[PDB]
UniProtKB/Swiss-Prot annotation, chain A:
GO terms for biological process: nervous system development; neural crest cell differentiation; proteasome-mediated ubiquitin-dependent protein catabolic process; protein polyubiquitination; protein quality control for misfolded or incompletely synthesized proteins; protein ubiquitination; regulation of smoothened signaling pathway; SCF-dependent proteasomal ubiquitin-dependent protein catabolic process. Coiled coil: none annotated. The keyword Nucleus applies. Part of the SCF (SKP1-CUL1-F-box) E3 ubiquitin-protein ligase complex SCF(FBXL17) composed of CUL1, SKP1, RBX1 and FBXL17. Interacts with BTB domain-containing proteins such as KLHL12, BCL6 and BACH1; specifically recognizes and binds a conserved degron of non-consecutive residues present at the interface of BTB dimers of aberrant composition. Interacts with SUFU. Interacts with PRMT1. It comes from the Eukaryota. This is F-box/LRR-repeat protein 17. Belongs to the FBXL17 family. GO terms for cellular component: cytoplasm; nucleoplasm; nucleus; SCF ubiquitin ligase complex. Keywords: Cytoplasm, Neurogenesis, Nucleus, Ubl conjugation pathway. Residues 1-47 form the F-box domain. The gene is FBXL17. Its main location: cytoplasm. It is found in: Cytoplasm; Nucleus.
From Swiss-Prot, chain B:
There is a cross-link at K128 (Glycyl lysine isopeptide (Lys-Gly) (interchain with G-Cter in SUMO1)). Disulfide bonds: none annotated. This is S-phase kinase-associated protein 1. PANTHER family: SKP1 (PTHR11165).
UniProtKB/Swiss-Prot annotation, chain C:
Belongs to the bZIP family. CNC subfamily. Residues 19-85 form the BTB domain. The chain holds residues 16 to 128 of 736 of the full protein. This is Transcription regulator protein BACH1. It is found in: Nucleus. Heterodimer of BACH1 and MAFK. It comes from Homo sapiens (Human). Ubiquitinated by the SCF(FBXL17) complex or by the by the SCF(FBXO22) complex, leading to its degradation by the proteasome. Under oxidative stress, reactive oxygen species covalently modify cysteine residues on the bZIP domain of BACH1 and release it from chromatin. If the BTB domain of BACH1 remains intact, its beta1-alpha6 degron is recognized by FBXO22, promoting its ubiquitination and degradation. Transcriptional regulator that acts as a repressor or activator, depending on the context. Binds to NF-E2 DNA binding sites. Plays important roles in coordinating transcription activation and repression by MAFK. Together with MAF, represses the transcription of genes under the control of the NFE2L2 oxidative stress pathway. It comes from the Eukaryota.
From Swiss-Prot, chain D:
The keyword Ubl conjugation applies. The keyword Transcription regulation does not apply. Component of multiple Cul1-RING E3 ubiquitin-protein ligase complexes commonly known as SCF (SKP1-CUL1-F-box) complexes, consisting of CUL1, SKP1, RBX1 and a variable F-box domain-containing protein as substrate-specific subunit. Component of the SCF(FBXW11) complex containing FBXW11. Component of the SCF(SKP2) complex containing SKP2, in which it interacts directly with SKP1, SKP2 and RBX1. Component of the SCF(FBXW2) complex containing FBXW2. Component of the SCF(FBXO32) complex containing FBXO32. Component of the probable SCF(FBXO7) complex containing FBXO7. (Microbial infection) Interacts with Epstein-Barr virus BPLF1. This is Cullin-1. The gene is CUL1. Expressed in lung fibroblasts. The chain holds residues 15 to 496 of 776 of the full protein. One of its GO terms (biological process) is protein ubiquitination.
Length: 375, 146, 113, 448
C-alpha cells in the first residue's frame, strides 16, 4: 500500500479536493513529493484570495513570479495592498479573464488603467463599492480591451455618461450589464447601449437617473432575458407593455419600488408573458386582482413576491394558489391585512407552494437542527 | 445486448451492454470499431476489482449525468475496504475511464487526508519523513500567509 | 406568539454565529439575518429578495451613521428602541432615509429635542 | 513498462487499422493497453509517442501520393474519394486507442502555454494537408468543374464523387491552433466555381440570344435558374445558395436588360400575357431596373386611351354612355392585366391611375368642346340618364361610375350639374328606387 505509486494525475485529482489552507499547511509539510505536487500550475490561476485582510501584503509579486498564466483573480473585501500590488500583477499576468475587486476602497483609477493596458484579452470586470473610480480610467478600459462580456459598476458615484459612451462604442461582445444607484447616468447611455450592443442578456439600472424615454429604447434587444428596473425616476406604464410584448425572451422582471405601476400592467404581462419565470412586485399599488390575473391568465410562473403593498388582502393569495398551474413562491413579507390563521391551513393545504411571511421565522429558527447548543 | 469480458488471471464475466457502456473506453471501442462474441481481455484488471466495478456500475445504471461531501451511503458502505483494494479500484477506474468511481474514490482518499496533522498522515499512508529541519522550517515559513 | 422566537435570532447575532447578511455602515460591519431586516423595512426587502445565495452584502449610503444604525437593529430584534436626548437627529435621518414603517417621524420628533 | 519494446507491436496494429482488415476486440485492447502503460510510468518519457505518431502519419501519406499524383480527371476523383473515407474512419480507431494520450498529455501539454500539440484526430486531419496541398488542391477541383460542366447534355454526373470532395474540403477547415470551418471550401472550390459559372453563362446567353427570339431565352433562363438550385442541396455545404443565385442573375438577366424593354413594348402591342408575367418575374429578382418597364406601360395605356376616343367619333360629344363605356373598358382591360401579370404591385397600379387621369380630363372631345370640363358634364349626364324614370345592375353600374369619378380631378362642375338635374328629377318625381339616390349620396359622402 503506497500512495506514491499512483500516477501524478491521480494525486493531482486527490489534492484538488482539498482547500488552500489544508494544501499549504498540511500536505506541503509531509514530503517533498507532495510539496512539489501542490505547487503545480493548475492549483494556481484560480487565486481567489478574498477575505484575507492581514494576509495579502506586498506579496502578489511573489505569487505571480513563481506562477504565471493566471486566468482568474478574486481580491474582494481586501484591505492591505496598495495600488501598486495590482498594477504590477497585470504587468506579469497577460491572461486575466475574471478580475473581481469588490468593495476594496483603497484602489483608484490607475489599477483599472494598468489592468486594461496590460491585459488585451479580458472578459469580466466587477468592481463594487469603490468610490474613487472616475471616467478617466473607464475610457482606457473601453478603448483598449474589446473583449469584455460582463461588467459590474455598482455604487460608484463618479461614473457619468461620458465614460459609459466610450465603453459602449467598443466592447461589442457585451452580454450582461449591472448598474446600481449612481447618478450622472441618464437615458443618453441606455439609448446607446441598445444600438451598439445587440448581444445583451442581463440589464440592471437600479436607482439610476433613467427615464421611460430611454427605457423604451430596449425593445431593440431581441436577446433580453432579465430586467432590474427598480426605483427609477419615471417609467410611465405603456413602456412596460411595449417592452414585455416585443422581447419574447424575458425570464425575470424585477420592476420594483415603482409607485405608478398599476394592476393592468400585471394582467397584460400575465396574458402575454410566455417565457416569464421571475416576477418581482414590492410596494406597488396592486389591489388583490394582480394575483388573480397571474394565476389565471399566465401559464409559466414560479415566484411572486408581492410585499409591502398597502392594498393586499386575503382571497387573493388563496385564489392564485388554486388558479395558477405552477407556483413555487408566494412571498407576502409585511402584507399587514393577511391573517396568520389563513396561511397556516393554506400552507398545509398546498405543500408545493412555500410562502414568505414575517411569521415564517421558524424556517430560519430551524437551521439550529445542525448546531443547536443554544437553549 | 450482452458483452463478455475477461480478467487478468483468467476469469470470464458476462454483463449487459448498457452496464459496460458506463466505461468510456469500452463504449468508444463498440462505437468506432464495428460477430461470434468472444472474451474481450482486460490485462490491467484482475478478478476481485472487476467484480467490484461490475457491482458498482450495476447499481449506478440510472444516475442522470448533468469538493463535495455528499458521498451517498451506498458508496461509503461499498468502499469499506483496505487501502490496497481502494487504490486498485482507483487504478481500474482510471484504466476503464469511469468518472463516477474515480470521483468517489478520490473524495474518499481526500477525506482520509482531511483533518489530520502531517505526522498522522505519515502514519496513515506510510510515508517516510524525508524533510530536513531547515527545509521544513522554510516550507512552513513560506506558507505563513495561509 | 412572535416572541420567544426572534430572541433565538438575537442570541445568534450577539454571539456572531449563523449570520447571513453583513451591512457596512461607514466601514464598520454589522451582522444580521435575512428575514429580520426584510420585515424591518421595504428598502432592505427590495435589495434582499433580488438575490438568492448564502452570503449577501448590502452597503448603505454615506448619510447613514453608525450612531443612527446602532439602533433600529436592536429595535428590529427586541422591538424596543432607546431614546436619549442625544442621538436623535441621526436616528430620525436614518429612519426617514430607510423608510421604516414601524416608527414614523411624527411619533419620533415629539419631545426628544 | 518500457518505452521501446512497445513500438514493435504497436506499429503492427497501427499499420493494421489502416488497410482495413477487420480487427478483433482482443487486439484493440492490446494496443490501448500499450498506450496506457507507456503513458503511466515513473514521466511518460516526454513527448516521444506524439512525435512517433506524427512521423508515421507523415510517412504514410508521402508514399500514398506517389500513386495518384499523375492521375487525370475522373481517375483522380475516384482516388481522392475512395482514399478519404478509408483515412477518416481509420483515424478514428486511432482516436480512442490513444485516448490516454488525449486526456492527460495534450490537455496538459497544451493549455499551459503551447502550440502545435493537437488531438490525434485533429493531428491526422492537419497532416492530411500533406497530400491535398501538392496536387489534389488543383487536380480534382478541375475534375469537379469538368464533371459539373455536363449541364449541356451529360447525365449521371456521379453525385457521390463531388459530394465526397466537398465534404472533405469542408471538414479540412482550419483546426490548427485556436480552439463553421468554411475557410478552405471558399478559397479552393467556390472561388473557381463561380468564375466558371459566369464563363459558361456568358457564352450561352450570347449564343442563344442570336438565333432564337427573346421569348425562348426568357423561358430558358427560368429553367437554368431553377437548375442552379438543385445542383446545390446535393453538393451543398449550404452557404452558397445566397451567393451563386446572385451571381447567376447578373449574367442571365441584369446585363441583357437592354432588349427587354423593346420586347416589353412589342408584347404590350399584342395581347401576350403569360410572357409579360415571365418578364416581370425575371426582372423582379433584380433591383434597380424594375421601374424602367413601368413608364412604358403608363405611356401605352395613355395611348390606348386616346386611341379609342378618337375611334369613338363625333357622337361622343352627345353620347355620355358611350364616352363612359370607352374609358371603363380601357380601365378594365389593363386593371385585369396588372392584377394578373404584375402581381398587383403597387407601382404598376399607381402607373395605371397616373394615365387614366390623363385621358379622362384632357383627351379629345374635351378638346373639341374647348373645355376640360366636358368630361364631368358627360359623367353627370350619364348618371342621370341611368338613374331616371324610364336593381342589381343599378348598383354595379354606379360602382363603375364611381371608379371613373376618382380621376376627374375637378368636382365643382360635377356637383353643379348633378344638383341641377337632381332638382329637376326630384321636383317632377322622375326617380326610380329612391334608395339608389340615397346610396349615390352616401357614395359621394364616402368620397370627396
Amino acid at each position: 500500500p503506497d500512495i506514491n505509486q499512483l500516477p501524478p494525475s491521480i494525486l493531482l485529482k486527490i489534492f484538488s479536493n482539498l482547500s488552500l489552507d489544508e494544501r499549504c499547511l498540511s500536505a506541503s509539510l509531509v514530503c517533498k513529493y507532495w510539496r512539489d505536487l501542490c505547487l503545480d500550475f493548475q492549483f494556481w490561476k484560480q487565486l481567489d484570495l478574498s477575505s484575507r485582510q492581514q494576509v495579502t501584503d506586498e506579496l502578489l509579486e511573489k505569487i505571480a513570479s513563481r506562477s504565471q498564466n493566471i486566468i482568474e483573480i478574486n481580491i474582494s473585501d481586501c484591505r492591505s495592498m496598495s495600488d501598486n500590488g495590482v498594477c504590477v500583477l497585470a504587468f506579469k499576468c497577460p491572461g486575466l479573464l475574471r478580475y473581481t475587486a469588490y468593495r476594496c476602497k483603497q484602489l483608484s483609477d490607475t489599477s483599472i488603467i494598468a489592468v486594461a493596458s496590460h491585459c488585451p484579452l479580458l472578459q469580466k470586470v466587477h468592481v463594487g463599492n469603490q468610490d474613487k473610480l472616475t471616467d478617466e480610467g473607464l475610457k482606457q478600459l473601453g478603448s483598449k480591451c474589446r473583449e469584455l462580456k460582463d461588467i459590474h459598476f455598482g455604487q460608484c458615484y463618479k461614473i457619468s455618461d461620458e465614460g459609459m459612451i466610450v465603453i459602449a462604442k467598443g466592447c461589442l461582445k457585451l452580454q450582461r450589464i449591472y448598474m446600481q444607484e449612481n447618478k450622472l447616468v441618464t437615458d443618453q447611455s441606455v439609448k446607446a447601449f441598445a444600438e451598439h450592443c445587440p448581444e445583451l442578456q442581463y440589464v440592471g439600472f437600479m436607482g439610476c437617473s433613467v427615464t421611460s424615454k430611454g427605457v423604451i429604447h430596449l425593445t431593440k434587444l431581441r436577446n433580453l432575458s432579465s430586467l432590474d428596473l427598480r426605483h427609477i425616476t419615471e417609467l410611465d406604464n405603456e413602456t412596460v407593455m411595449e417592452i414585455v410584448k416585443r422581447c419574447k425572451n424575458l425570464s425575470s422582471l424585477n420592476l420594483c419600488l415603482n409607485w405608478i405601476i398599476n394592476d393592468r400592467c400585471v394582467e397584460v404581462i400575465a396574458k402575454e408573458g410566455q417565457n416569464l419565470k421571475e416576477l418581482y412586485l414590492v410596494s406597488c399599488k396592486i389591489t388583490d386582482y394582480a394575483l388573480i390575473a397571474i394565476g389565471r391568465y399566465s401559464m409559466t410562473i414560479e415566484t411572486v413576491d408581492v410585499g409591502w403593498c398597502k392594498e393586499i388582502t386575503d382571497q387573493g393569495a388563496t385564489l392564485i394558489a388554486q388558479s395558477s398551474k405552477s407556483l413555487r413562491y408566494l412571498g407576502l413579507m409585511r402584507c399587514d391585512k393577511v391573517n396568520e390563521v389563513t396561511v397556516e391551513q393554506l400552507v398545509q393545504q398546498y405543500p408545493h407552494i412555500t410562502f414568505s411571511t414575517v411569521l415564517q421565522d421558524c424556517k430560519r429558527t430551524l437551521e439550529r437542527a445542525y448546531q443547536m447548543g443554544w437553549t | 445486448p450482452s458483452i463478455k469480458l475477461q480478467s487478468s488471471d483468467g476469469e470470464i464475466f458476462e454483463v449487459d451492454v448498457e452496464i459496460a457502456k458506463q466505461s468510456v473506453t469500452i463504449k468508444t471501442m463498440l462505437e468506432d470499431l464495428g460477430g461470434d462474441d468472444d472474451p474481450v481481455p482486460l490485462p490491467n484488471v484482475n478478478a476481485a476489482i472487476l467484480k467490484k466495478v461490475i457491482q458498482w456500475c450495476t447499481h449506478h445504471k440510472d444516475d442522470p449525468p448533468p469538493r463535495t461531501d455528499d458521498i451517498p451511503v451506498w458508496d461509503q458502505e461499498f468502499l469499506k475496504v483496505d487501502q490496497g483494494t481502494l487504490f486498485e479500484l482507483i487504478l481500474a477506474a482510471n484504466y476503464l475511464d469511469i468518472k463516477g468511481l474515480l470521483d468517489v474514490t478520490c473524495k474518499t482518499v481526500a477525506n482520509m487526508i482531511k483533518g489530520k496533522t502531517p505526522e498522522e498522515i505519515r502514519k496513515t499512508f506510510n510515508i517516510k519523513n524525508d524533510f530536513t529541519e531547515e527545509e521544513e522550517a522554510q516550507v512552513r515559513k513560506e506558507n505563513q500567509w495561509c | 406568539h412572535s416572541t420567544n422566537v426572534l430572541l433565538s435570532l438575537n442570541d445568534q447575532r450577539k454571539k456572531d454565529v449563523l449570520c447571513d447578511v453583513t451591512i457596512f455602515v461607514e466601514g464598520q460591519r454589522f451582522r444580521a439575518h435575512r428575514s429580520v431586516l426584510a420585515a424591518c423595512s421595504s428598502y432592505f426587502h427590495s435589495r434582499i429578495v433580488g438575490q438568492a445565495d448564502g452570503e449577501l452584502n448590502i452597503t448603505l449610503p454615506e448619510e447613514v451613521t453608525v450612531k443612527g444604525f446602532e439602533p433600529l437593529i436592536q429595535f428590529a430584534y427586541t422591538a424596543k428602541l432607546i431614546l436619549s436626548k442625544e442621538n436623535v437627529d441621526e436616528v430620525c435621518k436614518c429612519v426617514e432615509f430607510l423608510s421604516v414603517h414601524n416608527i414614523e417621524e411624527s411619533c419620533f420628533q415629539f419631545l426628544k429635542f | 513498462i518500457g518505452l521501446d519494446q512497445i513500438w514493435d507491436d504497436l506499429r503492427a496494429g497501427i499499420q493494421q487499422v489502416y488497410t482495413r482488415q477487420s480487427m478483433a476486440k482482443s487486439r484493440y485492447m492490446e494496443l490501448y493497453t500499450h498506450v496506457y502503460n507507456y503513458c503511466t510510468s515513473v514521466q511518460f518519457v516526454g513527448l516521444e509517442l506524439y512525435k512517433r505518431l506524427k512521423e508515421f502519419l507523415k510517412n504514410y501519406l508521402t508514399n500514398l501520393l506517389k500513386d495518384g499524383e499523375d492521375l487525370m480527371d475522373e481517375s483522380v476523383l475516384k482516388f481522392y474519394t475512395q482514399q478519404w473515407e478509408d483515412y477518416r474512419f481509420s483515424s478514428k480507431v486511432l482516436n480512442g486507442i490513444c485516448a490516454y494520450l488525449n486526456r492527460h498529455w495534450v490537455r496538459r501539454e497544451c493549455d499551459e502555454g503551447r502550440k502545435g500539440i493537437y488531438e490525434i484526430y485533429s493531428l491526422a486531419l492537419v497532416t492530411w494537408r500533406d497530400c491535398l496541398f501538392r496536387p489534389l488542391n488543383k487536380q480534382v477541383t478541375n475534375a469537379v468543374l469538368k464533371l459539373i460542366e455536363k449541364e449541356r447534355n451529360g447525365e449521371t454526373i456521379n453525385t457521390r464523387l463531388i459530394s465526397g470532395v466537398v465534404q472533405s474540403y469542408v471538414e479540412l477547415g482550419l483546426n490548427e491552433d485556436d480552439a463553421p470551418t468554411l475557410t478552405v471550401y471558399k478559397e479552393s472550390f467556390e472561388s473557381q466555381f463561380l468564375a466558371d459559372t459566369e464563363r459558361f453563362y456568358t457564352r450561352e446567353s450570347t449564343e442563344f440570344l442570336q438565333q432564337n427570339p427573346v421569348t425562348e431565352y426568357m423561358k430558358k433562363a427560368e429553367a437554368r435558374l431553377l437548375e442552379e438550385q438543385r445542383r446545390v442541396q446535393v453538393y451543398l455545404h449550404e452557404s452558397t445558395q445566397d451567393e451563386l443565385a446572385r451571381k447567376c442573375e447578373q449574367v442571365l438577366i441584369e446585363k441583357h436588360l437592354e432588349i427587354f424593354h423593346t420586347e416589353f413594348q412589342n408584347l404590350l402591342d399584342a395581347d401576350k400575357n403569360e410572357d409579360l408575367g415571365r418578364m416581370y418575374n425575371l426582372v423582379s429578382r433584380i433591383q434597380d431596373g424594375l421601374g424602367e418597364l413601368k413608364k412604358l406601360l403608363e405611356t401605352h395605356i395613355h395611348n390606348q386611351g386616346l386611341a379609342a376616343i378618337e375611334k369613338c367619333g363625333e357622337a361622343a360629344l352627345n353620347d355620355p354612355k358611350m364616352y363612359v363605356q370607352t374609358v371603363l373598358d380601357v380601365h378594365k382591360k389593363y386593371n385585369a392585366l396588372v392584377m394578373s401579370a404584375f402581381n398587383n404591385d403597387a407601382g404598376f397600379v399607381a402607373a395605371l391611375d397616373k394615365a387614366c387621369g390623363r385621358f379622362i380630363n384632357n383627351n379629345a372631345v374635351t378638346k373639341m368642346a374647348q373645355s376640360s370640363s366636358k368630361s364631368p358634364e358627360l359623367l353627370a349626364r350619364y348618371c342621370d340618364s341611368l338613374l331616371k324614370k324610364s336593381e342589381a345592375e343599378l348598383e354595379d353600374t354606379l360602382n363603375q361610375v364611381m371608379v371613373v369619378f376618382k380621376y376627374i380631378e375637378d368636382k365643382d362642375v360635377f356637383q353643379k350639374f348633378y344638383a341641377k338635374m337632381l332638382a329637376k328629377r326630384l321636383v317632377h318625381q322622375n326617380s326610380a328606387s329612391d334608395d339608389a339616390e340615397a346610396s349615390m349620396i352616401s357614395k359621394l359622402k364616402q368620397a370627396c
